[PDB]
Amino acid sequence: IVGGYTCGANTVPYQVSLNSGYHFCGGSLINSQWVVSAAHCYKSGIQVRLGEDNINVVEGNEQFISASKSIVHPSYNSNTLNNDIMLIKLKSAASLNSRVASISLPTSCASAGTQCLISGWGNTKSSGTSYPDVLKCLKAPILSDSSCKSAYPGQITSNMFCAGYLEGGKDSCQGDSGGPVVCSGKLQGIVSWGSGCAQKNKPGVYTKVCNYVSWIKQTIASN
Ligand SMILES: O=C(O)c1ccccn1
Ligand SMILES: O=C(O)c1ccccn1
Ligand SMILES: [Ca+2]
Ligand SMILES: [V+3]
- CATH label of the domain that carries residue 149: 2.40.10.10
CA-based end-to-end distance of the chain: 33
Domain co-membership, 37 together with 71: yes
C-alpha of residue 24 to centroid of ligand 2, in Å = 7
- Indicate which technique resolved this structure: X-ray
Please state, in angstroms and rounded to a whole number, the distance separating the CA atoms of residues 152 and 199. Answer: 13
Tell me how crowded residue 169 is: count the other CB atoms within 10 A of its CB.
13
Residues with CB under 6 Å of ligand 2 are 24-25, 40-41, 177
Distance in angstroms (rounded) separating the CA atoms of residues 190 and 193 = 9
Nearest CA to ligand 2 atom 3: 177
**41 and 93 co-located in one domain:** yes
Q: Of 24, 123, 138, 174, which is best to mutate to test ligand 1, by the most ligand atoms within 8 angstroms of its C-beta? A: 174
**Who contacts 19 (Cβ-Cβ below 8 Å, separation ≥6)?**
46, 47, 48, 49, 64
135 in the same domain as 159: yes
199 is in an annotated binding site: no
Q: Are residues 91 and 125 in the same domain?
A: no
State whether 135 and 82 are in the same domain: no
Residue whose CA is at the smallest distance from ligand 2 atom 9: 177
Residues 111 and 205 in one domain: yes
92 and 131 in a single domain? The answer is: no
CA–CA distance, 176 with 122 (Å, rounded to integer): 5
Where would I find the H helices in 64-223? 145-151, 213-221
Q: Are 77 and 108 in contact (CB under 8 A)?
A: no
Q: Judge if 109 and 200 occupy the same domain.
A: yes
**Do 97 and 143 have their domain in common?**
no
Same domain (yes/no): 97, 108: no
Number of the ligand closest to the Cα of 135: 3
Q: Is 173 in the pocket of ligand 1 (CB under 6 A)?
A: yes
Q: Ligand 1, atom 1: nearest CA belongs to which residue?
A: 174
Closest CA to 209 of 4, 28, 55: 28
- In angstroms, rounded to a whole number, what is the distance separating the alpha carbons of residues 77 and 222? 23
Count of beta carbons in the 10 Å neighbourhood of residue 5: 10
- Distance from residue 55's CA to the centre of ligand 3 (Å): 4
- Are 199 and 143 in the same domain? yes
Resolution of the solved structure (Å):
1.1
Total structural domains in the chain? 2
Dihedral (CA of 167, 133, 20, 64) sign: negative
Cα distances (angstroms) measured from residue 87 to each of 28, 35, 201: 10, 6, 31
| 173, 141 contact by CB (below 8 A) | no
Please tell me whether residues 118 and 200 are part of one structural domain: yes
If you measure from the C-alpha of residue 54 to the centroid of ligand 1, how many angstroms do you get, rounded to a whole number?
A: 20
Segments forming the whole domain that contains residue 32: 15-102+212-222
What residue type is assigned to position 113 of the chain? G
- Is 177 labeled as ligand-binding? yes
Ligand nearest to the CA of 190: 1
User: Ligand 2 center to residue 41 CA distance, Å?
Assistant: 6
